[model samples]
Target: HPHLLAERISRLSSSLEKGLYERSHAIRLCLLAALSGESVFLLGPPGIAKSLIARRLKFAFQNARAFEYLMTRFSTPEEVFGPLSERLTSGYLPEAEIVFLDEIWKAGPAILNTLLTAINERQFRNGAHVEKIPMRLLVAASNELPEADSSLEALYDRMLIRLWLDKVQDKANFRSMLTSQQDENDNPVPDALQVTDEEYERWQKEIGEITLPDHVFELIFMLRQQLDKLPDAPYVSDRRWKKAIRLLQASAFFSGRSAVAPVDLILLKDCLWYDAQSLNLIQQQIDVLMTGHAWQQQGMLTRLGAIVQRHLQLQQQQSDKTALTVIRLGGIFSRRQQYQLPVNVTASTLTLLLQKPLKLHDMEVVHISFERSALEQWLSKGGEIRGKLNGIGFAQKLNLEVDSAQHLVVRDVSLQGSTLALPGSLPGEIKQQLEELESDWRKQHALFSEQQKCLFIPGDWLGRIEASLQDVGAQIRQAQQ
Candidate 1:
């Protein structure tokens, strides 16, 4: 039976996809709401499968009572709150289990006033008597939220779940739907869908006692506080809050969780807002509240890189220098160490280190050189090396030379490193980080040139000079041998 529920959910997800429904989460919410005996309002433009999804949900419950009506200015109040004409004589009323009112906002002021009481208290006043209606849930569809000028605000507030349906984004699904045949005579509902009495009773029983953990309750409270603190946030009435809690419980039931988990929070976050913009903002804020600690400092990409590096290092077993170099390159670049070189330079020594000819065609290279004392002072002062030679982007290269006294000279090249691209409108923490990096780079460069006697060259020229100097180093080594 659990498997059956899972399979049913999967099938519903598939059908939602086929129907080009954008808000898959909305479908799940609707299912949860239906199971919980709570109503929902599908709020979006027409031709987006709002009505179709409601009909499909109706099929999910056995002996599920479905009452659908398209409301207009001329719509009679009798259809929604039930006929009051009989109340003058016998004083009796009837109620439907599940009701779908399409274009509900178009219901005139007369019907609007009647619906407020009927939807909220499940009762209507007829003549001098009050009649109770045994309704389970009401699913309403509207093109938009009720306007400030409308009388349907009270009715709108009654529907707790608001779903914004949209068209499919998947190219394959769209193409398939386009190619499929359109037969007016064919049944719109899929043949595989069927509602049985047992299934309905089981869901109802499960939803009644669905459990929620203390933490989820705390999270909901925190979110409510956040929404309340916002300047222009719509006030969520106490009744709606209670309904939302029940909705969460129902979600926990449908997902087969004994206690609510963070996953159920998704529905709560999505369902709490009245409009798309507000919904997006609230959802993003909730994401921050839930996952902020883990992702607050660095972006996910950086965290992923760190994780992969750690995994690789844990798997490594080799002890050789080459193995160490491989691991260092994989883990340490742009992280801990900066590039540096000795000052006693020759072309041959540079060529050997680079392992390639120095040529620049479609490439840009930057080189930085520092004197020994200055380099030592800079390093001692906690200065880091970055590739920013003369403000042009550059690559690191080594330059070596030997004086007449046979003293070897080596120089290191530096280039500017980037954490992120500069934003057009710099503000907040990003601007601060950029300024800090630039200041650090300037200080280090000044110290290097003033004390260390370092010189920076374009990488290509450095490469050419290093190649020629490497031959000299080779000859000297050969002579010594």
Candidate 2:
């Protein structure tokens, strides 16, 4: 039973998923927040299972207590924290394990400071008698995200786990909800999910002990930098980034792993989005980084395939055209002159200058031709589009400056060569992962619910991956040979 904490979580998740139609993610996050000792914010309109989730999650643990309230614009302090002498949670709550506040944003300014203090410090002024609240977690729900209008940003900042509860999207689940009679025993947690407090506390302690690999640190760092650089991406606080680390560690613990895996990064689908539209973009970014995000993988591979296809065609055309005006005998084009220039060139214009690299506009050195063939050869050689293909918008979310055949002579090219090789292998950390990838990367395929929230490698996904680039991979290999 040393693994009872994980075992209980699986049971609770199964029970919760069974009771709530199309709400596995919300339930999972709630459980994770409790395990990580962080707060949870569920954004959804009224009548979605908001209250039910809090109650159910509470039921998952033995002897757990819960407090529930609906906040209205005119609600008062006594209603939430209780009046004066009864102030030890108004003789009702200070020790409650879980508290659910609905329409939470409607909370007036009067109680805001008190609530923030209790949430942050777990100690409250109960009318000057400073006291501690044994509350394990707070579950706050709202129809809209805490907007700038309310200055609840500080409160919002503390809810380390965030999830959006959507209406049942599964047709069958919807039908079942309408047709099936409600079972009295249908709780978010079942008797079977008996995770003991001792086990829960032990796991929480162990979760802190779960150290992240360097790449995980590097990824979190890069993700923050990239978020800042992206024009539309929101400004995530350093606080949130720090909080997210705990969430990811909890995620790895839930996955039954001792170390953080790239797959666990999938959970960010809940935390990072700044605006309505940013979620899709951020998810797309993380999907590309997860290594097994197939739809994204296929999309990226298609871009590469098209570029390779164009190169193959151009090579064929150049082969035929160059064949007609052959060399030798006494060598040279007797009347024509062969020109060679030092190979250095800038990063931007290399491709299109070669001959209208589609969508390319600038013609930096258009007039000069150190071999229109070098221009064409660069196109044929593909030393140019490498950046166009490898740049940030597409497969860039992944570790770039990688891929052994990263367009030879590529990575930030020079005058002497059409390309410049990055001169190294994948990061040492990633190198070990590559070996592990070939042997066993299928673990990512587990614990995933769908495409957006989770990513995975399908059956023989690696084989399919190789197939997607086989022709071009072969060509690159052949060229090197």
Candidate 3:
């Protein structure tokens, strides 16, 4: 039944859309509002067929009752709703299935006030008792928006779906409209494709069955915050936000989807804005989220993870390899004594624990050097070595090998990882590249974090990217020190 009804509405929408130029969006919004049991307000100047859209909507249902009226400042409620003293309700708004009120802002406060409860609650007060109106949709059109601080604010707020209809902009479409032979009153849709009254009521009940996924809710939540952040933004009430869900559900139902998706959120540009300025802002906010912004960030984050992983891997490999140690054993003992020094010495400290530790003095220079890997070569530039000559402190120039050497036992050979420099621009290159990437990652992360509340990017991807960033950051800092 849902599928059949959805198909019927799809055909019905196309039928209503037939021969209408630049009104597809307008027609679709009308049909969706009708399905959601909501109201549509079309804002445009005259001759754009705003009123005609309301007229075409009645043919979508079988034996649909329609009531149309053009309002003015002098119009009375008796002509629009019904006479106050008479019980007669036929041919008035209270009994219609579809109602169109043109120039709605021109209606006096009396009629506008009476319509506030009628549109919001779907009930009208007769002579004494209130009667439930069969109104499934009420579309209002105006050449201008209701003035701010006017009494029409509440009534205007009842209109949940607002659209800005414009004249056809495309020359091709404009030409087609200029030469088309279709009559404005001709019903393009056949009766078989129209929704039966019973099916219409049933669809209203079933639309609630359409699920709203958490991600879509999160996106709406994000959109709410963004809208509030704008300067002088229109105020969207909690009730209005809650009522918007019905349109989304109806949109999903008509598309034969069991759950609301992010794409359906595009319709919010209709429900959320109060005017064209706010409408443009709302459109931009939603489009920025839906349009490949998240996709690009995901791609960059993936690349960031790769680069960070490579940097950490290089650091790990450098840590594992043993660098060559060179000691220039200079400054002979001159007293000529073999104090039982070991023939071969292999240890971090090179002083053999001789009988007296083989203390040495004057003209004696002992150099202990640690050979940096290719990456560390640059760090070793202008690097000097400092160690004790058998407990006597001395500093010597670091070299690959000892220049001139007699026997000497070097002690306390120390090599800080910092002095083990990078061979060339490679370290600077990696660090600089990582720094640039890290800066970009921060900016991208800020945006993605906001979007993450919408769950646009996968959680695991952020985790991986962040972990890699941390790893590379640690390595870069250590290398710098």
* Top of the candidates by lDDT: 3
| Tens digit of per-residue lDDT, candidate 1, span 1-481 | 6545655655654453344334555656666676677788887778766776666565554465566778978887665555654543121123555677899888888877777777777787776777776556678998778887556777777788877766667888678556766442223345465446566667777666777667567777877888889876667888888887777666655544555554456555545787767787766766655443111212322433444333323222111121101011124334432222343322221211111112222343222223434333333333443323322444333343322322223343432221111101122333344344334434433432332210111123324323433443343233221
Model 3 accuracy (lDDT, Cα):
0.66
Tens-place lDDT digits, model 2, residues 226-333: 788888886788888777888888877765667765556666767787457777777666655554232233433454445444443444333322211111122444
- Give the Cα error of residue 103 in candidate 2, in Å: 0.3
Q: Which residue pairs come into collision in candidate 3?
A: 375-422, 375-423, 376-421, 376-422, 377-422, 377-423, 378-422, 379-421, 379-422
State which candidate has the highest TM-score. Answer: 3
Score every model by TM-score.
0.56, 0.63, 0.65
Give the TM-score comparing model 2 with the true structure, all chains together: 0.63
Q: List, residue by residue over 221-321, the lDDT tens digit for candidate 3.
A: 87788778888678999989988888888887887668776656767778888987888787677666555233234444455556655654454345324
Error of 2 at 240 (Å): 0.6
Ranking by TM-score: 3, 2, 1
By summed lDDT, the worst window of 10 consecutive residues in model 3 runs over: 416-425
Which residue ranges in model 3 land beyond 4 Å of their true spot? 292-481
Please give the RMSD of candidate 3 to the true structure: 14.0
